[PDB]
Design a protein around this ligand. Sequence first.
Ligand code: CLA
Ligand code: CLA
Ligand code: CLA
Ligand code: CLA
Ligand SMILES: CCCCCCCCCCCCCCCC(=O)OC[C@H](COP(=O)(O)OC[C@@H](O)CO)OC(=O)CCCCCCCCCCCCCCC
Ligand SMILES: CC1=C(/C=C/C(C)=C/C=C/C(C)=C/C=C/C=C(C)/C=C/C=C(C)/C=C/C2=C(C)CCCC2(C)C)C(C)(C)CCC1
Ligand SMILES: CC1=C(/C=C/C(C)=C/C=C/C(C)=C/C=C/C=C(C)/C=C/C=C(C)/C=C/C2=C(C)CCCC2(C)C)C(C)(C)CCC1
Ligand SMILES: CCCCCCCCCCCCO[C@@H]1O[C@H](CO)[C@@H](O[C@H]2O[C@H](CO)[C@@H](O)[C@H](O)[C@H]2O)[C@H](O)[C@H]1O
Ligand SMILES: CCCCCCCS[C@@H]1O[C@H](CO)[C@@H](O)[C@H](O)[C@H]1O
Ligand SMILES: [Ca+2]
Ligand SMILES: [Ca+2]
Ligand SMILES: [Mg+2]
Lengths: 504, 81, 38, 30, 34, 34, 341, 65, 39, 37, 37, 30, 30, 34
Amino acid sequence: GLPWYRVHTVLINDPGRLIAAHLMHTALVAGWAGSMALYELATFDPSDPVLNPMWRQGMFVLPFMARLGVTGSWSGWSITGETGIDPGFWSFEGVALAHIVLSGLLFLAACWHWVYWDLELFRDPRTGEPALDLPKMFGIHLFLAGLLCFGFGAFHLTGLFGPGMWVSDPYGLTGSVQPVAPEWGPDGFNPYNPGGVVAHHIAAGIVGIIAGLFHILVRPPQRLYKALRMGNIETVLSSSIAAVFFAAFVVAGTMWYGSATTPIELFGPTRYQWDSSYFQQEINRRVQASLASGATLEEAWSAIPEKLAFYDYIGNNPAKGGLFRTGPMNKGDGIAQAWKGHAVFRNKEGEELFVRRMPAFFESFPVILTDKNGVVKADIPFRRAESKYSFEQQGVTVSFYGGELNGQTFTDPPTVKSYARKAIFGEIFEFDTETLNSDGIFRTSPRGWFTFAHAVFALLFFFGHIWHGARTLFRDVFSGIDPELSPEQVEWGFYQKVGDVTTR
Amino acid sequence: TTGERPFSDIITSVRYWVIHSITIPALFIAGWLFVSTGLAYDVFGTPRPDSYYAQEQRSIPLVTDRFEAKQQVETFLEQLK
Amino acid sequence: SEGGRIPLWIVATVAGMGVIVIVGLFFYGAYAGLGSSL
Amino acid sequence: DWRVLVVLLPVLLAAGWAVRNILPYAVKQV
Amino acid sequence: MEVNQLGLIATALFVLVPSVFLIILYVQTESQQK
Amino acid sequence: MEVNQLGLIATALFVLVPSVFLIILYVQTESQQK
Amino acid sequence: RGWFDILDDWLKRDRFVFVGWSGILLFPCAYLALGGWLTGTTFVTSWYTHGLASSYLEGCNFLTVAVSTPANSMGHSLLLLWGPEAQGDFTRWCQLGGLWTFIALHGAFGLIGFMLRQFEIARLVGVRPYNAIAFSAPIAVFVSVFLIYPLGQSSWFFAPSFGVAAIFRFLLFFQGFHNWTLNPFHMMGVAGVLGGALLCAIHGATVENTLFQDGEGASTFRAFNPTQAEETYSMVTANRFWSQIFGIAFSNKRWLHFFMLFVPVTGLWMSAIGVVGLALNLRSYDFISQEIRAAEDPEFETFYTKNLLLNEGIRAWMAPQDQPHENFVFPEEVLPRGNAL
Amino acid sequence: ARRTWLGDILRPLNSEYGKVAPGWGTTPLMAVFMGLFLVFLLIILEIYNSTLILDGVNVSWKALG
Amino acid sequence: TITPSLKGFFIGLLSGAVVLGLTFAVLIAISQIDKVQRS
Amino acid sequence: MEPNPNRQPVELNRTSLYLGLLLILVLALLFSSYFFN
Amino acid sequence: MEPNPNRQPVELNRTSLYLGLLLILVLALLFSSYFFN
Amino acid sequence: METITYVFIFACIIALFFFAIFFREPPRIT
Amino acid sequence: METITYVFIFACIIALFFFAIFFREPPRIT
Amino acid sequence: SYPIFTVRWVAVHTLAVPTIFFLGAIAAMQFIQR
Ligand code: CLA
Ligand code: CLA
Ligand code: CLA
Ligand code: CLA
Ligand SMILES: CCCCCCCCCCCCCCCC(=O)OC[C@H](COP(=O)(O)OC[C@@H](O)CO)OC(=O)CCCCCCCCCCCCCCC
Ligand SMILES: CC1=C(/C=C/C(C)=C/C=C/C(C)=C/C=C/C=C(C)/C=C/C=C(C)/C=C/C2=C(C)CCCC2(C)C)C(C)(C)CCC1
Ligand SMILES: CC1=C(/C=C/C(C)=C/C=C/C(C)=C/C=C/C=C(C)/C=C/C=C(C)/C=C/C2=C(C)CCCC2(C)C)C(C)(C)CCC1
Ligand SMILES: CCCCCCCCCCCCO[C@@H]1O[C@H](CO)[C@@H](O[C@H]2O[C@H](CO)[C@@H](O)[C@H](O)[C@H]2O)[C@H](O)[C@H]1O
Ligand SMILES: CCCCCCCS[C@@H]1O[C@H](CO)[C@@H](O)[C@H](O)[C@H]1O
Ligand SMILES: [Ca+2]
Ligand SMILES: [Ca+2]
Ligand SMILES: [Mg+2]
């Protein structure tokens, strides 16, 4: 009988039952979407979009609902922290419900197409054999896709008839859903320009429509029909798998490097913002602007938004996790409660010292303090016997500005050391580690998990493509080679052209 | 066979060696001179033993700016007086 | 000219000796000049 | 640069030599 | 030790679901006419 | 809530083991000739 | 029989080195990757990217030469010769590490070329394309290690450099920073490679020691004819031998050879998945229960905690020279060290 | 096989199985488009990669505020 | 406006076009000359 | 080896499958609260 | 309803069962430590 | 996870209702 | 529970060795 | 009876010519002193 890994091949010549199986797959996926949204709603804490946003809480589908304009709950809250909003039906709950109902209907349709597989529609009218006109089908489906793409761009994203999309400032402080106008100049191909996403769906939509009509009205060249085996549905399987792993590598990339479609308020900051100290540079700029305007040190640092400071913290860097460190980021360092304020370290001579930050590569990292020129001034020693730079020897103190420890100064070596230890992670926060029994070990954000899943799946679908492409082009021999294969066909020099018996 | 002359034939033929007893040494000598004339250093930008550091410098000339990297290297080379 | 005039064994012996010579030179270089640690 | 001529004089002397020696058979082939 | 509490059921289903798949296929193969 | 931690695996196995027993028996019955 | 078909004719001629349509991609890219590696390792420095000598010209040997990755400051620049970094200058391009991306990219397209070659020749000869299919594992490994992994990290700098000792360094870096030996995907990789080697060995030896006497020679290689119909060794004897020695044995030759494809190909694929994880620092670095116990209990020791101490040493002692762009200065007193050493 | 109303409607859309245009047909044109598409991808890659840098195109979070 | 890197892009584009074109010109020419004999 | 003459084929018809699964699932629905306690 | 002509019997021989169970059990032995973490 | 368990079992029961009704072995008169 | 799980999987594997060897499908010559 | 300038010839020389040149270079390098 069929081996276990071939059971589904019974679908190859049964268009009706193939459609049933696809309906069932679609039902399962829609059902997964519904279920996932329900679970996230049952676990999501909406009370603090500043220090406890969705990406700290292991939310995976919530940011995708938010990206396209679903930001409210029937229960009255919004992901931007508003209250007393009426989201209408299309709340998170509404979306979940819609997906569940869709799943049900698809299930039922699947049953019908499974039972009534033998429709005349699936029969070649000349031969009576099952047959699908794949090139014309491609035309039809591409036309439809083009319509839908165009409409998504022209109506949804523009806000012309729809909510728009998530946009934000360059530091992800004030994100919200807005209508976006298409950008038709070169900056449209800038990944950080949303106008480009709009323009894309409009233009690629129109192109999809034109090309769709082309593929509906014009038959394939015989030479391509033969070369790509267009009578064989597995060829479509191969090229579709190729298209899909391409798409998957792309979304993995734009998730990891960031773009207008992977906002940091929805997925968390990127690793490269930590690498280049993006947020720290902005914070320092603001503080300096404040001081230059006549503010005090305490005033300048207190004017820094907690949200901004929280971005400047390595616990939110997606490159600090673990493959089997499961769950939300809150399960690691804890649920962030408050900024402690900016720590300034000084030695006994009153020189300001700066803690060397941990690079993402390192699970652990030493504690080293330098002056503004990178000269080592203090550290926490391993071996003590020849220590020169201990906090005790150098009389290191730490004063805080802004946040909850604002205006306070600490001089006892243990406390100063503890804060130095925290300064290697960037800005310092107070965490609730009790509510979730957090274990103090960094976990990655949804930016990380999405990127991982999709790079892996992409890589695997490469093999899928290879396998099904092979199955397509070698259909004649995949039960074995011609038992009467003449030795002359593989001997050397018998034919002038390899495998061409007409060239003896 | 595939129509070409057997290598056994070729490499044991007199003519082959008349040709290659010239062409192989010529190439060898060419490469030799590519090094001995110092041209290699300049084609590939490789430091001679006295061009890794200026006399009292002990800092690697590491490239640190992507788009003005070229100018950085040029500056580093000027720094060898 | 005609093939087989020079005995394949002589060619093999000479070629082989040449290889031993050049490799020998490279190992010599491990102990002299650059890369010698000296 | 005189060094490129001093270095690539062997290569071109070799190419010229073998061209000279293989010319009749090459013409016969072509 | 403070292990992951889902580890047990994770391991149990990881073993049982596909093993059961295989056992089902095997038994119904044996029962086919010889 | 503070539920018994084995309740989950207990329930899962309570369902799966006899369900699977039945599924094996049913499928090998269907696969018999006639 | 127009120009396309004439060209097809010529491409597919049965010559000493088969060309094919795939050859148009394969031969230039493979030639440029090999040539680039030889050019770089013979003549090109890594002073400006790593602070390393890396060529025969500088005094390196076969074990220590490499074509090294670009500086970390280059990020993931394609680093094209005509690009904004080198701006057409061949020498500066070499100094900036252009040959690394040159080799990795021409190499990637060359590997595509080679696998296409496998398909094309299989199709022309009339065999199933399982050789190409098996070659998907080399592809997965190359793409995950040389492309995906650095693309996940800060820059091309942390890709493997093309050299023997350079690769050894890549290994040690992965141990120290990723605890890669702990990773179950790497472990599956190891099982596939060592298992592949085992199957190679045992199958070769078994065939050679269950041969039928098909000649009078004491040297038995001549007593075989490629055109012969008969198995050249006894599968029945082989089966009884291994059944009585190991408890189980192959009885089916087709399954045997498919299995020989399956083990190492699958192993390499799994290792690829692991490296894709390491691209994001998504490591199997720790066992959380281990750490909680060990943190609270200073007498609790396992080989896992021992190896983490080793990793910590590797990181602290190798980072300043291995990562020069970071400008690490680790004073003596902070270096982790056991007693005396 | 079983006919239905909707089936009868859609019948023409699935009746031209195996129908081809003679020879190479529109392959040359197809080729042109593929060529263009290649160049197109090359452009966006290089823009994202900062290998291709255009006025008014700042590839950063600081693109637009 | 044509920036230095856009100019460079055109140079790469053109160079690749020249390489591919020369390659196929030579291949097609050789194929035209040395034809496979059939009967 | 001589085949054993005492062997007998086993059956579970579809209706018995449905009854059995109903029994198991409903028993689980009943006892699970007590399992979590 | 008329029978579907595309049906095929499925098989898993005993050796495949043993191999499959080995793969599953050994994968479990490998991955379980990581699931418990 | 308790809630998930209860809902899961309930859902399986409803699914079973569907199969037991629409995919029953059809009664046949002899 | 962890220890029990590890030892249980191991034990199942040993049992499997036993059946794969002594209760294998016998190889038969055709 | 045999051609001289073949695809094989080209392949062979694209490898052999650079190889001999390179070996000349590395040879020279053995006499470089710091
Ligand atoms: C669009 C996606 C897609 C589709 C529709 C198919 C369809 C098919 N595949 Mg292909 N394939 C794909 C992608 C796809 N494949 C990918 C990504 C890979 C690499 C992993 C492969 C590698 C592959 C091989 C090696 C083979 C096939 C075969 C087949 C055919 C028989 C399948 C079968 O009966 O399995 C039966 C499968 C089972 C009974 C159980 C499988 C359980 C899996 C391993 C674990 C659980 C998966 C999990 C439930 C899925 C989660 C969703 C996913 C998105 C993560 C069928 C035409 C077979 C074939 O060609 O036969 C002639 C075959 O030998 N495929
Ligand atoms: C009926 C219409 C409909 C609508 C309005 C929605 C709406 C939504 N879905 Mg649901 N969904 C639906 C049907 C629908 N869905 C169906 C039928 C399924 C089963 C397949 C799903 C399965 C599903 C999952 C698993 C998820 C959602 C999610 C969502 C939300 C995020 C949307 C998103 O980011 O997609 C992004 C869409 C794309 C990136 C489309 C890519 C298109 C590719 C590139 C096309 C390639 C081929 C094409 C032919 C190329 C040529 C085109 C041509 C123009 C050139 C959003 C509320 C997410 C969510 O938030 O769940 C709660 C989520 O995780 N949906
Ligand atoms: C696209 C896939 C995807 C991604 C990126 C996410 C992402 C996330 N999920 Mg979601 N989820 C998904 C699909 C996904 N999910 C699916 C399909 C389900 C249904 C089961 C869920 C149900 C779910 C729940 C219940 C929860 C999450 C949670 C989360 C968050 C934590 C992730 C985590 O800890 O994983 C850990 C990842 C691993 C441990 C990797 C596993 C690797 C496998 C085991 C390897 C398999 C090896 C294989 C056997 C080898 C075979 C070899 C053979 C071929 C020879 C994260 C944001 C958590 C959360 O925080 O919610 C708020 C949470 O509680 N998810
Ligand atoms: C088929 C074989 C092949 C392939 C696939 C590649 C591929 C590559 N080469 Mg290699 N190379 C090759 C052969 C090949 N090369 C040969 C034979 C040589 C010797 C001349 C080189 C010498 C070489 C150098 C010196 C460099 C490369 C580089 C590259 C990389 C960048 C190329 C690029 O961006 O082109 C862009 C151009 C195209 C893709 C051409 C497409 C043309 C379209 C389809 C037609 C339209 C053209 C249009 C009419 C032109 C109008 C121009 C006008 C506006 C002025 C890429 C991986 C670069 C690299 O690796 O940097 C790290 C690099 O510096 N190559
Ligand atoms: C003579 C040199 C021996 C070198 C060491 C042994 C090599 C062969 C051992 C492999 C065992 C495999 C398991 C049994 C496999 C098995 O059953 O073998 C079977 C095979 C065939 O046996 P025959 O009976 O036909 O011939 C062997 C005798 O009976 C004499 O005729 O044996 C040989 O071919 C012997 C080859 C001698 C020459 C081999 C030299 C190869 C190594 C050269 C050195 C390389 C070093 C590289 C380092 C950089
Ligand atoms: C009938 C009906 C209905 C209902 C319906 C419903 C209720 C449905 C549901 C549905 C559902 C509720 C569904 C669900 C689904 C799910 C899924 C499908 C999942 C899957 C999963 C997976 C596949 C996973 C995997 C994994 C794991 C496990 C681990 C890690 C890794 C991975 C991720 C791979 C209504 C009333 C509406 C109406 C009509 C009728
Ligand atoms: C990169 C590049 C390019 C290319 C170039 C080329 C392509 C080159 C080639 C080159 C070459 C192609 C070279 C070669 C070399 C070779 C050598 C250097 C060899 C050596 C050898 C030896 C040393 C041996 C050894 C041994 C062994 C192996 C085993 C046996 C024993 C003995 C020990 C003898 C171009 C211009 C396009 C552009 C720019 C960039
Ligand atoms: C919770 C995890 C559980 C995992 C469960 C996985 C479910 C797997 C279901 C397997 C389905 C088996 O499908 C079963 O195939 C056999 C043959 O193989 C069919 O059997 C058919 O073929 C045989 C052989 O010609 C005939 O003797 C028999 O009369 C005929 O009906 C059954 O009609 C079908 O029911
Ligand atoms: C199957 C569930 C159907 C439930 C329908 C409830 C309609 S609810 C209704 O929806 C409108 C559109 O968003 C809103 O404008 C309005 O405020 C809201 O009350
Ligand atoms: Ca605790
Ligand atoms: Ca000197
Ligand atoms: Mg030397």
